[PDB]
Amino acid sequence: TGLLDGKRILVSGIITDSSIAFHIARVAQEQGAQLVLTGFDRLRLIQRITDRLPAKAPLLELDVQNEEHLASLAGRVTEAIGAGNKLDGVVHSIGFMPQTGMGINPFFDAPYADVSKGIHISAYSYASMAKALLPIMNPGGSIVGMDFDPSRAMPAYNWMTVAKSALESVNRFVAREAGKYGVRSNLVAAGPIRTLAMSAIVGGEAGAQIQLLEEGWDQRAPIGWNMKDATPVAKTVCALLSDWLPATTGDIIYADGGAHTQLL
């Protein structure tokens, strides 16, 4: 018997096999969840990444900036899940920020056009997705998004930090809307993870300062932190997807090795 036995969950944000969403999807399927996966612009290549998952899963096209995609998403999911069946979970693992708003680039030199695009994708889309999917969610359901603790400023992450701050605020309002359906809405604030996205930033002064953040994180974390292992994060997301945190919503769960509770 698995944690998510007989639950229908939509997982978005799977770009590579190193994406956090892939490990969330992997662990979810290991725990008995029936999945619906979304992607964009490389569905042939994405499906082949998806094929490495334990179980087969339908793949739907979703650009969270496309209003037509969002307006038809709910229906397209139903034609895949089956009529009379609803979703029990939605995982939002989508974030983006142009180079000008991250890395070694001066914080002031990021034009708003780039920042607005990042915030649309990283923060506003969380509400867009909730708006589209809540009608086809069962009571007791769970919406989960991804987060990186933005309560304090930091190097390199720059404007992505701001987009995460907005996301945290958006989540609290999504929770108000989700409550009417009996649905919870939460974020998982993870410690630093070596996704291909972040791995690129490290290589592409800033990269050294990222290493300083990574090193300091593991030391600070009372139980340690492995940036190469996304599994503890994925299990945390699955925990929120289950029925074992049923009184938690509009909230943030920190899967960071306990680093945010330690100063030094």
Residue from 126, 157, 181, 225 touching ligand 9JA (CB under 6 A): that is 157
The span of 32-40, 82-90, 150-158, 234-242 binding ligand 9JA (CB under 6 A) equals 150-158
- Candidate residues 183, 210, 234, 238; the one interacting with ligand 9JA per rule CB under 6 A: 210
Give CA–CA dist 66/206, Å, rounded.
33
Give the x-and-dash track for 5-44 against ligand 9JA (CB under 6 A).
Answer: --------x------x------------------------
Largest CA distance in the chain: 55
Q: Cβ closer to ligand 9JA: 79 or 229?
A: 229
- 225-244 residues in contact with ligand 9JA (CB under 6 A) are 227
Q: Pick from 197, 216, 235, 245: which binds ligand 9JA (CB under 6 A)?
A: 197
In the bound state, the residue with its beta carbon closest to ligand 9JA is: 95
Q: Report if residue 221 touches ligand 9JA, rule: CB under 6 A.
A: no
Residue 142 CB burial class (10 angstroms; 0-12, 13-18, ≥19): buried
Residues making up the annotated binding site for NAD(+) are 19-20, 63-64, 94-95, 164, 193
Structure tokens at 167: 């996301």
The one segment of 39-47, 78-86, 91-99, 129-137 that binds ligand 9JA by CB under 6 A: 91-99
Annotated binding site: 19-20, 63-64, 94-95, 157, 164, 193
Instruction: Please give the residue ranges that form the binding site for ligand 9JA (CB under 6 A).
Output: 13, 20, 93-95, 122, 146-148, 154, 156-157, 160, 190, 192-195, 197-198, 210, 213-214, 227
